[PDB]
């Protein structure tokens, strides 16, 4: 399922996705890390905060 960024997040790590409010992340799935999701944003697959992106219902 896709997700929409509601809060700006700065990727501290290399596997972290730098999500910006208003962006749509392709195929956002839930990871084994509480508060971390996996999706293709900005042309890269990374991990971003769960409370920063809202599922596209």
Q: Is the dihedral of CA 4, 42, 49, 46 positive or negative?
A: positive
Number of Cβ within a 10 Å radius of residue 46: 20
Q: Are 18 and 39 in contact (CB under 8 A)?
A: no
Domain 1-57 top-level CATH class:
mainly beta
Q: Are 19 and 36 in contact (CB under 8 A)?
A: no
Alpha carbon distance 50, 52 (integer Å)? 5
**Measured between alpha carbons, how far is residue 44 from residues 37, 41, 47, 57 in Å?**
13, 5, 10, 23
Give the technique used to solve this structure.
NMR
């Amino acid at each position: 399922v896709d997700y929409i960024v509601e809060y700006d997040y700065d990727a501290v790590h290399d596997d972290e996705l730098t999500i910006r409010v208003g962006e749509i992340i392709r195929n956002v799935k839930k990871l084994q890390e509480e508060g971390w999701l996996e999706g293709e944003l900005n042309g890269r697959r990374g991990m971003f905060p769960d409370n920063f992106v809202k599922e596209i219902k």
